Each structure stands twice: as structure tokens, then as C-alpha cells.
């Protein structure tokens, strides 16, 4: 019974890989005799370069090629079990079928096992792992567990649950469930029908080599469907990483230029140490500098050390992901950003103090200029008053009695004049300070003070000139 | 004859002129200096001006006595010229300053005295209110100023901890940051007092050594220091988690590091690193010691650097050869990939970034529309 | 201690109150009657 199941399975498995090769077999014990179909089957399932098969018309040529294909099997190393190279050309049915299983096992069962367990253990473990949530399925051996054929339909739900109605299937119809599972595999997964359902379910124990061959083709088909996950998770990994790192790189250039530009416009304002003419104007400058330090520099301080934390995390994300270091623009560099922020801070410390020291010096000038204006006017009137009483030369018409009386009246005009000496000295002193403190109108305060001083000299000499006239009259009548 | 009766008039007129003339320029000098302009920037400067004005107010009864004594002579002159009916101009030939003139000028001095003390009391009130502002500023600046210095030191100490836990350091730094956010409430109130002082034209504060700019700089320094050091903790955790080592294992390494530390300032090294190698593994200390002496520093063994060099030999990462092989299995083992293939498997969003940024294949097995994933992926990694 | 990427890039080392001008106040005081000494 084992030979009926091996013949159908190993023929349609050979046909599944020989359809590609451009040839087909009908009698596995006759077509493989020359060794041409066997050497071609090894070239396809391995995808490797193989020696050249002689045509095999002669009797010695056929054996020479069977030995070439069996010498290729010595690169794999697989053990030989009751097999002869001559009896392949002879047409030994039990020998050829057993040798085909050697080829199916090495190329479609050993490269399958990744859990270091040789041949059946690696394939059984996969069948048990994929059929674990199924309750009606029981896979322990490659014969009685496969005989029901309900677990093969579960394998197609394990990778394609949308394609099969698992719920409908039961153990009451093993034949129809096996038939349905092989039709789905042939029409969609491209796995040609190698096991006949009617033959397996009748027999008490089916051949393990034939069943394992059919399962290996199912595993191989779902290897690329599950390999799509490895390809998707890695592309999602590098794309999400490169998209986030590129977004964060663009925000550094954006934030660096926005900060770089605000520093560019607030640096000239901060280094303008040219004072104004009035204390009102400089006190105004102090309030806009007060607004700068209270409502303009604090957020730009946060955006400077925000640019630092953003650049810091950017270089770490690139270092921990093996990506190269981020290189900013020529002007938006690390040293260029800290360099511009360094230029800004020097200008702002002087600006405070300076502004006050200008405000105070103006405060004094504003006061002393008004005080001078007040003292100059009260003296200008007093000096005009005393100037006119001296211009009245009505003394020439007088007798010694009137002259001596007029001399004591002029004596008072001398002592009261001397009282206004320190008043003129104070005018000169507070105009001298406005000149020393660089008052804007110190050119016109010096004129008003010079004219007052030049007139005070003439007032004094004219005072002594009139005494000498009265004295010339008193010592005239005397003799 | 009448030369004796008339001589008394002349001796009275000259006593008037000799008393009225000096008193007149005293009043002329008092009328001007009483309404004089003043500017003071100290409580002593207003206290001296108010004292000098009280001294002037004190001699006013004596000045009124001389005012009546001078008008007594003037009245007695008009009395004897009326009493003896001698025709004359009745205008003192020695003093040009009439008695009415001295009377109206005295009334003016009398009216300026209440004005001068009310203006001096106004400036005393200004000076007293200004001194309160001076003290208010010194009360906060001398408390806020040193507070900032302490949080600066606390943060500088928390960023040099030997018993490093990282998660404990982050929770400690998040509470130092929380102290700063609840102290700003006091600095913005100090800014208001500074504004009240500078708007009162006050550059005078002996009660404090700290200027507002000293606090403004110190606060910005503290604010940029907490933000800097918090990022340092987040960076150390992000690089530790990426390195693969666990949180408890990291603390275990920090603990093993701490005991093999006799130097303390620096990492206890030389035969102490040999004492770390003897704890785990076997021999291999002649070529590994010589390699660690070369791996002390690539350019001009460190404490934090020692931790990094122990975790450096254990290296496992994902690079370009991993994704070029993953793009080849996508193209079903082709040295190129089609636009149709990229959107057939990949999510439509992530598929379009490849079809745009991937270059021309132009390889040995060339075909029109073939994208080169070997040059796309190898560019993503530098 | 704990190095920063910002510091290594710019060039970090691996191992480590205003006296105002005084003014001559021109404040004047009215002469009290008699002399200045009293």
C-alpha cells in the first residue's frame, strides 16, 4: 500500500518543480532511468550550477549520469539506504522511490528546520505550532494525524483565516475535507495535487515520506507570505526614523534662523550709547529696556536653551541609530549660534547702568538750567534798575550841603551793590557747571552769563566814576 | 536859633539811613533765598534744609523788633516837622529806601515763610516715601539673590552624583524645577518694586549690594541651567535604554562602580579594572588591559567614560545591509525594485516616499523604471 | 561628569556696585536775622 501513495506524490512533486524545468514525467520508474530528468530536477529545486548530463543513448552513458547526480548528493552528505546507481537505470521501483525521498528531504525539509533538529522534528514542530489554537486538530506523527485531513484546512486558516470557513469543518467527513483542502492549495497557493484523498482515508497508515512531501510544499508557500512581515517592519522602522530625524532637522534650521534674526535686530539697539537731549527721552529709553528684560528677553532665553535641547536630542537619536552626525548650515552652526548670543549679552549689561548714569546727569542739568534762568532774570532786573539811577547825572546842579547829602546816598548804592556780589558769583558758578556737564544750550547760557558779567564790570566802574565826581564837587567848595 | 531844633531832624534822618539800608538788603536777600530752588537725594539733605529754615524762623521776632525800631525813627521825623511846622520835602536825603518800601517787603518775607516750610515738608514726605521703596527692594533682593545661588549649587551638585540612579535624579530635578516655578512669583513682584524706584528717579540703595540686573542675569542663568541639566538626564536615559541595558542592571553597574572607587573624584582604575575582570570571566587580561589603556581616551581612565567603555564592547545594532537585504526579498531577489512592487506590499503612505526618493538602477541587469534600493538605503545611513 | 553634545561641538574642555559721580549742590539758604553763627 505504501508504493501506491509514494508513486502519486513523488511524481506530482517532481512535476511541480519539473513544470518550470520544461519537462514532465508520467512513469517515475521509467523516465528517471536515463538520469536526464533527475539531474534537471536537482538543478531547479537547488537553483545551483550542476555538471553536464551525457545524453544516455548508450548503456554506459546512463549509469555515468546517475553517478554524477549521486556524486552531487555527496556535497550535501546525505546517507544512502539500500540504494544502487545501476538499479536506477535498471528501473528498480522500491529503489527509485526511496531515492526521490532523499532528494525531497534534503532540499525541501532540512533547510526548513531552524530549531537545529534534523528533518521530521523541525517540520513537525512547525505543524504543531501552527495548529495549536485548533481543538479538533491533533498532529503528532506524519501519518494517522494527517489521515483525517482536518488539520490541513486549519493550516490554510492559520495564514489565511479570511479564505477558509473553519467553523463548518468537522471529523464526520474526512474525505471531503481533504479534497477541499487540496483544491484550495492547487487553485490559489499553486501546490499541485500529489496525495489522493480516497486512497489515504481507506488505508490505516499512510506513508510518512509522501505526506511529509506535501506538507513541505505548504510550508514553503507560506514562507514568503510571512517573510513580507520582516520586510514591512524594517521599512516602517527606517522610514519612521528617517522621517522623524528629517522633521527634527528642519525644525533646527527653522528655530536657529528665527533666533538668529531676533538677535540681529536687537544687537544694534543695545549697543547705541548715544545719549538724548532731555531726561524725559532717556527715562523713556529705560522703560523700553525694562520691557525688553521683562517681556522680550525671557522667551528668547527659553528659545535659546530650547534650540540647545533640540540639537542635543537630535545628535543622540542619530548616534544611537548609527546614522551620521547632523551638519547644520554655515550660519546656523553651534559655534555661530552661541557666538551671536555672546555678542548680544555684552551690550545689555552696560546699557542698564549707562542709561541711569545719563538720566541722573540730565536730571541735574534740567534743574541747574532752570535755576540759572531764574537767578539770571532776578539779577537782570536788579542790574537794570541800578544802571538807570546812575545814568541820571542830575548832580552837577548842587551846593556843598546837597553834595554831602548826595555822597551818603551814593555810599548806600555802593554797599547794596556789594551785597549782590555773591549773587553774580552764584550765577557764574552754576553756568560753569552747565558748561562742564555739556548742557545742550551751554552756548547760550555762556552768552547770558558773559553779558551779565561784562555789564557788572561796567556797573562797578561807573559806580566808582560817579563817586569821584561827587568827591570832586565836595573838595571844590571846601577851598 | 532854629539850627538847634532842626539839627535833631538831621541826626534822626541819618540814624534812619544807617539802620534801614542794611535791613533792606537783608530782606532783599531773604526774599530771593527763601524761594530758592532745591534738589535733595538723601533724608539728611532735606533734614538740613528744614533745620536751616527753622533757624531763620527763630530770628523773625527780633527782625520785627528792628522793623518797628526803624519805623519809630521815621514816625518821629514826621512828628517833629508837624510839631514845629518847618516846610520841607519830607523825603530822607540820605536813604532812597522809603518806609513804605520796607513795610511791603516785610509783608512779602512774611508770606514766603509758610510757603517754604510747606515745600520742604512736601520734599521730606517724598524722601521718606522714597526710603521705603529703597528698603522694600533690599528686603527682597537680599533674599531672592542668595536663594538663586543655592538652587544653582543644588542643581550643580545633583548633576555630579556618585550614587547615580537617573530615575531618582529626574524626580529630584523635577522638584528643583518646581521650586523655581513657584519662586518666579516673587521675582516678578521685585521687578515691580524696581520700576517704582527707577520711576521715582532713585539711584541710591546702600541697604543692598545686589542690583536688579544681578538678579535678572542670575535668574536667566538658573533657568537655563535647570533646562540644560534636565535634558542631560533625559539624554543619559535615552542612550542607556537604546544601549539595551535594564534600569535595575544600570543601578547595579553604578553600585559596582561606586565600591571599586578609592579615588572618588576619578574612577579607581589600573589594577582596580583588573579587579573587575577577575570578578567575571577568565584570564585574557594582558591584551584586554593593553587595549583598555589605549581606549582611555582617543584624544586629549575616566569615571563616566569607564561605564561607557564597559558597555561599548557589547555591541549589537541595525544597519543598511539589513534593510538592503529586506528590500531585495521585497523585489523577489532582484537587484532593483519596481514602483508597482513598493505599493503592492508596503502601506500606501510609506510606499510613495520610496517611489519618489529612490534613484535609477542602471546596473548590470538593467530594465526601464527600475529603482536602485542599494543607493537609497546606503544613503539613509550616510 | 555628564557631557552635552552642544558643548563638545563648540569646543568644550574634557577636564574642567556702581559709584555715582558726586555733585556740588547749589542749594541756598536764606540768612537768618543778625549773623550766620547763631
UniProtKB/Swiss-Prot annotation, chain A:
Ubiquitinated by FBXL22, leading to proteasomal degradation. It is linked to Cardiomyopathy, familial hypertrophic, 23, with or without left ventricular non-compaction: A hereditary heart disorder characterized by ventricular hypertrophy, which is usually asymmetric and often involves the interventricular septum. The symptoms include dyspnea, syncope, collapse, palpitations, and chest pain. They can be readily provoked by exercise. The disorder has inter- and intrafamilial variability ranging from benign to malignant forms with high risk of cardiac failure and sudden cardiac death. Cardiomyopathy, dilated, 1AA, with or without left ventricular non-compaction: A disorder characterized by ventricular dilation and impaired systolic function, resulting in congestive heart failure and arrhythmia. Patients are at risk of premature death. Expressed in both skeletal and cardiac muscle. It comes from Homo sapiens (Human). GO terms for molecular function: actin filament binding; calcium ion binding; channel activator activity; cytoskeletal protein binding; FATZ binding; identical protein binding; integrin binding; LIM domain binding. Keywords: Actin-binding, Calcium, Cardiomyopathy, Cytoplasm, Disease variant, Metal-binding, Phosphoprotein, Repeat, Ubl conjugation. Belongs to the alpha-actinin family. It is found in: Cytoplasm, Myofibril, Sarcomere, Z line. The chain holds residues 35 to 507 of 894 of the full protein. Its main location: cytoplasm. This is Alpha-actinin-2. Residues 1-220 are annotated as: Actin-binding. GO terms for biological process: actin cytoskeleton organization; actin filament uncapping; cardiac muscle cell development; cell adhesion; focal adhesion assembly; microspike assembly; muscle cell development; negative regulation of potassium ion transport. GO terms for cellular component: actin filament; cell junction; cell projection; cortical actin cytoskeleton; cytoskeleton; cytosol; dendritic spine; extracellular exosome. Residues 4-108, 117-223 form the Calponin-homology (CH) domain. The modification Phosphothreonine is found at residue 203. It comes from the Eukaryota. F-actin cross-linking protein which is thought to anchor actin to a variety of intracellular structures. This is a bundling protein. Spectrin repeats lie at residues 247-357, 367-472. Homodimer; antiparallel. Also forms heterodimers with ACTN3. Interacts with ADAM12, MYOZ1, MYOZ2 and MYOZ3. Interacts via its C-terminal region with the LDB3 PDZ domain. Interacts with XIRP2. Interacts with DST isoform 1 (via N-terminus). Interacts with PARVB. Interacts with SYNPO2. The gene is ACTN2.
Swiss-Prot record, chain C:
It comes from Homo sapiens (Human). Expressed primarily in skeletal muscle. Detected at lower levels in heart, prostate and pancreas. It is found in: Nucleus; Cell projection, Pseudopodium. Belongs to the myozenin family. It comes from the Eukaryota. The gene is MYOZ1. Myozenins may serve as intracellular binding proteins involved in linking Z-disk proteins such as alpha-actinin, gamma-filamin, TCAP/telethonin, LDB3/ZASP and localizing calcineurin signaling to the sarcomere. Plays an important role in the modulation of calcineurin signaling. May play a role in myofibrillogenesis. Interacts with ACTN2, ACTN3, FLNA, FLNB, FLNC, LDB3, PPP3CA and TCAP. Interacts via its C-terminal region with MYOT. This is Myozenin-1.
